[PDB]
Amino acid sequence: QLSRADITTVSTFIDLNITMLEDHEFVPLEVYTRHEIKDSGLLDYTEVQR
């Protein structure tokens, strides 16, 4: 009696590798926050009047 792995084996199937799409996490990103846009002005009427 001999084991099943003692004889050479050939794959009769046509392998098809399937790599699922990895999960992705999106982080917040802004070129200029609303605070930066407000600060872009040279003068602010609110602060000047205050």
Binding site: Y32, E36, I37, D39, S40, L42
Partner: protein, 50 residues
């Protein structure tokens, strides 16, 4: 870069205020007030304030 160049500065001025007052029999009234911001000379900013 939209942020304006921010730097610290010190202002020096005198609030010159000359008012005209009319004295009645039983009351006082301001016939005119002249407010002006007079600048401080370099000699005073250096030899007196600083």
């Amino acid at each position: 870069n939209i942020a304006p160049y921010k730097f610290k500065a010190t202002m020096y001025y005198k609030d010159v205020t000359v008012s005209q007052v009319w004295f009645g029999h039983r009351y006082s009234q301001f016939m005119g007030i002249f407010e002006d911001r007079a600048p401080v000379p370099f000699e005073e900013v250096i030899d007196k304030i600083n």
